[PDB]
Amino acid sequence: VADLKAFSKHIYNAYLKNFNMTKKKARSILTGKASHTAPFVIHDIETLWQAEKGLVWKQLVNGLPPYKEISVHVFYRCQCTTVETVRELTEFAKSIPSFSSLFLNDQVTLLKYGVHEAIFAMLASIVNKDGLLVANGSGFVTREFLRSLRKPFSDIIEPKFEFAVKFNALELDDSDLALFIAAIILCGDRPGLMNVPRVEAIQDTILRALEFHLQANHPDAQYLFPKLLQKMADLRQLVTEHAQMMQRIKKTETETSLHPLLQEIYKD
Ligand SMILES: O=C(O)CCCCCOc1ccccc1CN(C(=O)c1ccc(-c2ccoc2)cc1)C1CC1
Ligand SMILES: CCCCCCCO[C@@H]1O[C@H](CO)[C@@H](O)[C@H](O)[C@H]1O
Ligand SMILES: CCCCCCCO[C@@H]1O[C@H](CO)[C@@H](O)[C@H](O)[C@H]1O
């Protein structure tokens, strides 16, 4: 048990070193306790335009694919963030010694099949029932606005809110999440994995570490560990549905570009 604390703290440090925003930072912004200035609320076309003229985005607008329409534009911003988060997750995983010890092709397999599950878990951190943070916490896009986008773009967004609000009710902190996300990435079930026994062994250790961490950090929280195992299963279903919806976008939205890295993740 005492051995897992060291293991856990290293994973937490990898998390702190590699992710742009913590849940702690996100919730302070969402509750209006973080700074002297509040996020700019994006809730319609006019405010989206004002945000693109005003807020500082990690990805410059000029850099996005040529403009098509509002729903597609919002989709392109979603892809921006997805790809950036894949980069952060890759570095997080590499800051974990037992992941970096795997052959590079298994690293790629784990990331390919794990990153969307991790993304949608981490998404909950910047979400509340009314919308989500964008542009490093400088903006807040309302759930209502995102609902108003045309199908298929509104359809691919709303189920993530449904998941997030339920996930946030578990009240995990950043140290819980670091272990949770590591367990999603270090998953021995992924297709085409070469060294399955090594990955299963690492996953098992992470989950033992997660169990012990939760007993210490959430001493009154009954059933939290099994609840999180179930959330892992729920994320797999969420990502299956997500991938199906992405296949439909590829089929029916032929004018919409998909980022080369995401094409490789979704290469069927
Ligand atoms: O599958 C892929 O990899 C790309 C396809 C993802 C499509 C589904 O993206 C969703 C769905 C639900 C909730 C959040 C996102 C995307 N997202 C975001 O952080 C995000 C959301 C909205 C905006 C935005 C900017 C201006 O107006 C709106 C910017 C960023 C986080 C998952 C990474
Ligand atoms: C940056 C980490 C995340 C990478 C995710 C993208 C993985 O794409 C896959 O790359 C493999 C190695 O090139 C190919 O053999 C596969 O066909 C392809 O699907
Ligand atoms: C083709 C559709 C493109 C939609 C917009 C996606 C842009 O994503 C950005 O592309 C860069 C180049 O890889 C990454 O380095 C950044 O991290 C990422 O934020």
Tab-separated table of C-alpha atoms and ligand atoms in Angstrom:
chain	number	residue	atom	x	y	z
A	1	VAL	CA	0.000	0.000	0.000
A	2	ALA	CA	2.742	2.487	0.901
A	3	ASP	CA	4.419	1.649	-2.399
A	4	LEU	CA	1.431	2.845	-4.378
A	5	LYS	CA	1.727	6.364	-2.845
A	6	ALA	CA	5.013	7.004	-4.596
A	7	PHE	CA	3.596	5.622	-7.810
A	8	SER	CA	0.527	7.788	-7.424
A	9	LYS	CA	2.468	10.993	-6.682
A	10	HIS	CA	4.638	10.514	-9.779
A	11	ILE	CA	1.526	10.167	-11.943
A	12	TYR	CA	0.052	13.267	-10.320
A	13	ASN	CA	3.284	15.166	-11.050
A	14	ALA	CA	3.105	14.041	-14.722
A	15	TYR	CA	-0.414	15.417	-14.809
A	16	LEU	CA	0.565	18.755	-13.261
A	17	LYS	CA	3.542	19.112	-15.587
A	18	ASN	CA	1.634	18.383	-18.813
A	19	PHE	CA	-1.967	19.616	-18.779
A	20	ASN	CA	-2.821	23.184	-19.682
A	21	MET	CA	-5.695	23.429	-17.261
A	22	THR	CA	-6.428	21.723	-13.994
A	23	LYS	CA	-9.881	21.015	-12.711
A	24	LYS	CA	-8.960	23.149	-9.725
A	25	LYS	CA	-8.266	26.098	-12.060
A	26	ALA	CA	-11.356	25.370	-14.188
A	27	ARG	CA	-13.736	25.245	-11.230
A	28	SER	CA	-12.368	28.468	-9.782
A	29	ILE	CA	-13.094	30.145	-13.128
A	30	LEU	CA	-16.516	28.568	-13.496
A	31	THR	CA	-17.509	29.669	-9.968
A	32	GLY	CA	-16.136	33.186	-10.323
A	33	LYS	CA	-13.285	32.988	-7.815
A	34	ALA	CA	-10.226	32.748	-10.085
A	35	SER	CA	-9.489	36.237	-11.373
A	36	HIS	CA	-10.330	39.913	-11.626
A	37	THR	CA	-12.018	39.195	-14.994
A	38	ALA	CA	-14.805	36.805	-16.018
A	39	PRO	CA	-14.919	34.643	-19.136
A	40	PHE	CA	-16.566	36.143	-22.215
A	41	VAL	CA	-19.852	34.396	-22.878
A	42	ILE	CA	-20.367	33.003	-26.338
A	43	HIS	CA	-24.047	32.329	-26.876
A	44	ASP	CA	-24.793	33.283	-30.469
A	45	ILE	CA	-23.272	34.256	-33.812
A	46	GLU	CA	-22.531	37.825	-32.797
A	47	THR	CA	-20.704	36.857	-29.615
A	48	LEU	CA	-18.829	34.051	-31.411
A	49	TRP	CA	-17.623	36.678	-33.900
A	50	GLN	CA	-16.673	39.067	-31.122
A	51	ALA	CA	-14.752	36.212	-29.424
A	52	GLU	CA	-12.831	35.440	-32.607
A	53	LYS	CA	-11.996	39.141	-32.899
A	54	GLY	CA	-11.276	39.452	-29.151
A	55	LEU	CA	-10.279	36.267	-27.214
A	56	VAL	CA	-6.822	34.814	-27.424
A	57	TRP	CA	-6.970	31.334	-28.906
A	58	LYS	CA	-4.150	28.786	-28.754
A	59	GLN	CA	-4.828	28.226	-32.443
A	60	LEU	CA	-4.956	31.393	-34.570
A	61	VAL	CA	-8.079	31.760	-36.753
A	62	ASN	CA	-5.971	32.264	-39.873
A	63	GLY	CA	-4.646	28.756	-39.194
A	64	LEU	CA	-8.034	27.052	-39.268
A	65	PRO	CA	-9.135	25.528	-42.590
A	66	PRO	CA	-10.955	27.968	-44.893
A	67	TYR	CA	-14.223	29.145	-43.458
A	68	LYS	CA	-17.412	27.263	-44.409
A	69	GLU	CA	-20.256	28.132	-41.951
A	70	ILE	CA	-20.887	28.595	-38.206
A	71	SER	CA	-21.501	24.928	-37.234
A	72	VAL	CA	-18.406	23.868	-39.193
A	73	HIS	CA	-16.359	26.610	-37.642
A	74	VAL	CA	-17.347	25.459	-34.186
A	75	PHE	CA	-16.434	21.885	-35.276
A	76	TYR	CA	-12.983	23.102	-36.344
A	77	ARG	CA	-12.465	24.714	-32.935
A	78	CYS	CA	-13.500	21.382	-31.348
A	79	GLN	CA	-10.875	19.587	-33.473
A	80	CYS	CA	-8.246	22.155	-32.437
A	81	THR	CA	-8.792	21.409	-28.823
A	82	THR	CA	-9.020	17.690	-29.378
A	83	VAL	CA	-5.649	17.603	-31.148
A	84	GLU	CA	-4.002	19.839	-28.557
A	85	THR	CA	-5.321	17.544	-25.818
A	86	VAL	CA	-3.942	14.493	-27.674
A	87	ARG	CA	-0.521	16.225	-27.573
A	88	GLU	CA	-0.835	16.837	-23.826
A	89	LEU	CA	-2.008	13.279	-23.165
A	90	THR	CA	0.961	11.937	-25.174
A	91	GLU	CA	3.385	13.918	-23.027
A	92	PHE	CA	1.543	12.898	-19.847
A	93	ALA	CA	1.827	9.224	-20.831
A	94	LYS	CA	5.542	9.604	-21.699
A	95	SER	CA	6.169	11.202	-18.239
A	96	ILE	CA	5.011	7.880	-16.789
A	97	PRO	CA	8.083	5.564	-16.669
A	98	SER	CA	6.247	2.263	-17.229
A	99	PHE	CA	4.508	3.659	-20.333
A	100	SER	CA	7.779	4.985	-21.758
A	101	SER	CA	9.332	1.541	-21.212
A	102	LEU	CA	6.845	0.023	-23.679
A	103	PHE	CA	7.901	-0.320	-27.312
A	104	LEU	CA	6.925	2.775	-29.269
A	105	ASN	CA	4.317	0.976	-31.388
A	106	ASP	CA	2.420	-0.128	-28.247
A	107	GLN	CA	2.615	3.467	-26.973
A	108	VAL	CA	0.936	4.532	-30.208
A	109	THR	CA	-1.734	1.805	-29.922
A	110	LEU	CA	-2.607	2.821	-26.362
A	111	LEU	CA	-2.873	6.499	-27.335
A	112	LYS	CA	-4.819	5.817	-30.517
A	113	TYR	CA	-7.509	3.854	-28.706
A	114	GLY	CA	-7.329	5.691	-25.368
A	115	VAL	CA	-7.124	9.404	-26.031
A	116	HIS	CA	-10.802	10.074	-26.748
A	117	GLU	CA	-11.883	8.286	-23.657
A	118	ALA	CA	-9.401	10.379	-21.671
A	119	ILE	CA	-10.509	13.557	-23.449
A	120	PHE	CA	-14.143	13.074	-22.608
A	121	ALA	CA	-13.295	12.321	-18.950
A	122	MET	CA	-11.145	15.432	-18.682
A	123	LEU	CA	-13.792	17.484	-20.523
A	124	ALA	CA	-16.035	17.236	-17.452
A	125	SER	CA	-13.493	19.437	-15.628
A	126	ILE	CA	-14.281	22.465	-17.797
A	127	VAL	CA	-18.047	21.816	-18.075
A	128	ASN	CA	-21.092	22.742	-16.059
A	129	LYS	CA	-24.717	22.141	-16.890
A	130	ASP	CA	-24.819	25.517	-18.728
A	131	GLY	CA	-21.740	25.315	-20.960
A	132	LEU	CA	-17.990	24.961	-21.147
A	133	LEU	CA	-14.765	26.929	-20.916
A	134	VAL	CA	-12.836	27.710	-24.088
A	135	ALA	CA	-9.615	29.603	-24.944
A	136	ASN	CA	-7.773	28.810	-21.784
A	137	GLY	CA	-10.663	29.938	-19.619
A	138	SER	CA	-11.112	33.309	-21.400
A	139	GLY	CA	-14.420	32.260	-22.942
A	140	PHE	CA	-17.499	30.279	-21.964
A	141	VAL	CA	-19.638	28.708	-24.670
A	142	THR	CA	-23.191	27.986	-23.676
A	143	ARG	CA	-24.729	24.590	-23.975
A	144	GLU	CA	-27.837	26.219	-25.460
A	145	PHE	CA	-25.798	27.740	-28.290
A	146	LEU	CA	-24.129	24.429	-29.023
A	147	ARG	CA	-27.552	22.743	-29.097
A	148	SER	CA	-28.615	25.267	-31.722
A	149	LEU	CA	-25.986	24.140	-34.220
A	150	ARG	CA	-27.294	22.132	-37.111
A	151	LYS	CA	-27.294	18.383	-37.085
A	152	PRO	CA	-24.916	16.533	-37.086
A	153	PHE	CA	-22.801	18.962	-35.114
A	154	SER	CA	-25.228	19.559	-32.206
A	155	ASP	CA	-25.778	15.750	-31.912
A	156	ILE	CA	-22.060	15.010	-31.425
A	157	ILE	CA	-21.790	17.606	-28.660
A	158	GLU	CA	-24.810	17.104	-26.357
A	159	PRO	CA	-24.085	13.530	-25.146
A	160	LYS	CA	-20.746	14.730	-23.724
A	161	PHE	CA	-22.542	17.216	-21.513
A	162	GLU	CA	-24.860	14.457	-20.354
A	163	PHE	CA	-21.835	12.358	-19.348
A	164	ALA	CA	-19.942	15.270	-17.781
A	165	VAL	CA	-22.623	16.496	-15.467
A	166	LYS	CA	-23.061	13.003	-14.043
A	167	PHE	CA	-19.267	12.511	-13.780
A	168	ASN	CA	-18.830	15.825	-11.940
A	169	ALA	CA	-21.303	14.702	-9.310
A	170	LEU	CA	-18.580	12.271	-8.147
A	171	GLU	CA	-16.520	15.367	-7.156
A	172	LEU	CA	-13.100	14.013	-8.164
A	173	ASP	CA	-10.058	16.248	-7.774
A	174	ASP	CA	-6.969	16.532	-9.928
A	175	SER	CA	-5.049	13.890	-7.995
A	176	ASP	CA	-7.947	11.402	-8.517
A	177	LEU	CA	-8.172	12.322	-12.195
A	178	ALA	CA	-4.476	11.791	-12.866
A	179	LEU	CA	-4.801	8.164	-11.785
A	180	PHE	CA	-8.150	7.740	-13.572
A	181	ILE	CA	-6.748	9.006	-16.894
A	182	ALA	CA	-3.605	6.897	-16.533
A	183	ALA	CA	-5.855	3.844	-16.105
A	184	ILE	CA	-7.739	4.735	-19.298
A	185	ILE	CA	-4.544	5.075	-21.345
A	186	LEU	CA	-2.842	1.979	-19.831
A	187	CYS	CA	-5.494	-0.425	-21.015
A	188	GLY	CA	-4.754	-3.984	-21.971
A	189	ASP	CA	-7.894	-4.416	-24.072
A	190	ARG	CA	-6.797	-2.201	-26.979
A	191	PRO	CA	-6.803	-3.843	-30.454
A	192	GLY	CA	-3.416	-4.830	-31.870
A	193	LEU	CA	-1.471	-4.423	-28.612
A	194	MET	CA	1.782	-6.323	-28.709
A	195	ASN	CA	2.697	-6.808	-25.073
A	196	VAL	CA	-0.736	-7.353	-23.523
A	197	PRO	CA	0.520	-8.952	-20.252
A	198	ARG	CA	2.866	-5.995	-19.522
A	199	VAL	CA	0.124	-3.438	-20.176
A	200	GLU	CA	-2.400	-5.451	-18.078
A	201	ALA	CA	0.110	-5.540	-15.198
A	202	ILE	CA	0.653	-1.798	-15.378
A	203	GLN	CA	-3.067	-1.136	-15.547
A	204	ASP	CA	-3.662	-3.335	-12.544
A	205	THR	CA	-1.095	-1.421	-10.512
A	206	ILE	CA	-2.651	1.900	-11.470
A	207	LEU	CA	-6.042	0.680	-10.414
A	208	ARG	CA	-4.692	-0.592	-7.044
A	209	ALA	CA	-3.089	2.824	-6.621
A	210	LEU	CA	-6.372	4.503	-7.553
A	211	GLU	CA	-8.290	2.407	-5.013
A	212	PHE	CA	-5.890	3.299	-2.207
A	213	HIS	CA	-5.776	6.972	-3.219
A	214	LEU	CA	-9.553	7.220	-3.053
A	215	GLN	CA	-9.696	5.647	0.424
A	216	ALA	CA	-7.270	8.312	1.661
A	217	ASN	CA	-8.585	11.270	-0.293
A	218	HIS	CA	-12.338	10.491	-0.132
A	219	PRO	CA	-12.666	8.628	3.181
A	220	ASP	CA	-16.452	8.969	3.392
A	221	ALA	CA	-17.149	8.331	-0.274
A	222	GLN	CA	-18.943	5.029	-0.378
A	223	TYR	CA	-18.641	2.950	-3.521
A	224	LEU	CA	-16.485	5.495	-5.347
A	225	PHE	CA	-14.012	2.964	-6.807
A	226	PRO	CA	-16.613	0.695	-8.352
A	227	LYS	CA	-18.468	3.782	-9.593
A	228	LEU	CA	-15.324	4.859	-11.414
A	229	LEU	CA	-14.851	1.398	-12.941
A	230	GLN	CA	-18.364	1.776	-14.306
A	231	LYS	CA	-17.504	5.276	-15.658
A	232	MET	CA	-14.612	3.704	-17.534
A	233	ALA	CA	-17.069	1.295	-19.177
A	234	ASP	CA	-19.448	4.242	-19.871
A	235	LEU	CA	-16.639	6.149	-21.583
A	236	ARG	CA	-16.004	3.249	-23.916
A	237	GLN	CA	-19.668	3.360	-25.016
A	238	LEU	CA	-19.517	7.175	-25.288
A	239	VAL	CA	-16.512	6.961	-27.598
A	240	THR	CA	-18.079	4.150	-29.711
A	241	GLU	CA	-21.107	6.446	-30.252
A	242	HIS	CA	-18.759	9.361	-30.921
A	243	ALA	CA	-16.839	7.402	-33.575
A	244	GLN	CA	-20.118	6.374	-35.247
A	245	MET	CA	-21.170	10.016	-35.414
A	246	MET	CA	-17.763	10.945	-36.843
A	247	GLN	CA	-18.224	8.318	-39.555
A	248	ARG	CA	-21.499	10.004	-40.477
A	249	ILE	CA	-19.840	13.415	-40.612
A	250	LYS	CA	-17.206	11.987	-42.953
A	251	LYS	CA	-19.938	10.491	-45.136
A	252	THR	CA	-22.416	13.356	-45.279
A	253	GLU	CA	-20.346	16.541	-44.574
A	254	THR	CA	-17.951	16.256	-47.487
A	255	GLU	CA	-17.010	19.964	-47.326
A	256	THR	CA	-15.772	19.631	-43.724
A	257	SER	CA	-12.059	18.963	-43.205
A	258	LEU	CA	-10.748	16.507	-40.629
A	259	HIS	CA	-7.331	17.008	-39.076
A	260	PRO	CA	-4.742	14.476	-40.355
A	261	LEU	CA	-4.016	13.095	-36.833
A	262	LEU	CA	-7.671	12.551	-36.137
A	263	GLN	CA	-7.980	10.833	-39.537
A	264	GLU	CA	-5.254	8.423	-38.359
A	265	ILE	CA	-7.060	7.794	-35.046
A	266	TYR	CA	-10.313	7.039	-36.947
A	267	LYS	CA	-8.655	4.999	-39.739
A	268	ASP	CA	-11.307	2.247	-39.214
B	1	LIG	O1	-13.328	13.525	-32.481
B	1	LIG	C1	-12.542	14.479	-32.536
B	1	LIG	O2	-11.373	14.307	-32.212
B	1	LIG	C2	-12.902	15.875	-33.052
B	1	LIG	C3	-14.384	16.170	-33.053
B	1	LIG	C4	-14.805	16.555	-31.635
B	1	LIG	C5	-16.203	17.160	-31.752
B	1	LIG	C6	-16.897	17.136	-30.406
B	1	LIG	O3	-16.251	18.015	-29.500
B	1	LIG	C7	-16.855	18.304	-28.329
B	1	LIG	C8	-18.069	17.731	-27.953
B	1	LIG	C9	-18.634	18.105	-26.746
B	1	LIG	C10	-17.986	18.981	-25.904
B	1	LIG	C11	-16.744	19.511	-26.273
B	1	LIG	C12	-16.181	19.163	-27.491
B	1	LIG	C13	-14.851	19.724	-27.985
B	1	LIG	N1	-14.004	20.248	-26.901
B	1	LIG	C14	-13.794	21.523	-26.637
B	1	LIG	O4	-13.022	21.838	-25.745
B	1	LIG	C15	-14.441	22.664	-27.360
B	1	LIG	C16	-15.816	22.821	-27.443
B	1	LIG	C17	-16.332	23.974	-28.080
B	1	LIG	C18	-15.470	24.921	-28.599
B	1	LIG	C19	-16.021	26.177	-29.247
B	1	LIG	C20	-15.267	27.277	-29.607
B	1	LIG	C21	-16.112	28.218	-30.148
B	1	LIG	O5	-17.397	27.709	-30.093
B	1	LIG	C22	-17.345	26.454	-29.502
B	1	LIG	C23	-14.096	24.761	-28.480
B	1	LIG	C24	-13.586	23.631	-27.849
B	1	LIG	C25	-13.319	19.304	-25.988
B	1	LIG	C26	-13.456	17.820	-26.283
B	1	LIG	C27	-12.174	18.563	-26.661
B	2	LIG	C1	0.442	11.172	-31.060
B	2	LIG	C2	-0.164	9.941	-30.363
B	2	LIG	C3	-1.556	9.558	-30.924
B	2	LIG	C4	-1.383	8.880	-32.314
B	2	LIG	C5	-2.756	8.351	-32.794
B	2	LIG	C6	-2.756	8.059	-34.306
B	2	LIG	C7	-2.383	6.597	-34.557
B	2	LIG	O1	-2.492	6.295	-35.965
B	2	LIG	C8	-1.987	5.047	-36.336
B	2	LIG	O2	-0.545	5.162	-36.532
B	2	LIG	C9	0.078	3.856	-36.781
B	2	LIG	C10	1.572	4.072	-36.789
B	2	LIG	O3	1.883	4.924	-37.859
B	2	LIG	C11	-0.503	3.269	-38.078
B	2	LIG	O4	0.130	1.989	-38.371
B	2	LIG	C12	-1.995	3.174	-37.939
B	2	LIG	O5	-2.598	2.671	-39.166
B	2	LIG	C13	-2.650	4.477	-37.585
B	2	LIG	O6	-4.055	4.288	-37.315
B	3	LIG	C1	-7.941	19.960	-40.987
B	3	LIG	C2	-8.913	20.466	-39.908
B	3	LIG	C3	-8.151	21.316	-38.868
B	3	LIG	C4	-9.122	21.800	-37.742
B	3	LIG	C5	-8.247	22.641	-36.767
B	3	LIG	C6	-7.245	21.796	-35.947
B	3	LIG	C7	-5.956	22.586	-35.608
B	3	LIG	O1	-5.278	21.941	-34.519
B	3	LIG	C8	-3.999	22.400	-34.216
B	3	LIG	O2	-3.079	21.900	-35.253
B	3	LIG	C9	-1.659	21.872	-34.875
B	3	LIG	C10	-0.856	21.170	-35.930
B	3	LIG	O3	-0.777	19.791	-35.693
B	3	LIG	C11	-1.450	21.217	-33.518
B	3	LIG	O4	-0.052	21.202	-33.200
B	3	LIG	C12	-2.210	21.980	-32.504
B	3	LIG	O5	-1.944	21.434	-31.176
B	3	LIG	C13	-3.663	21.933	-32.802
B	3	LIG	O6	-4.367	22.759	-31.868
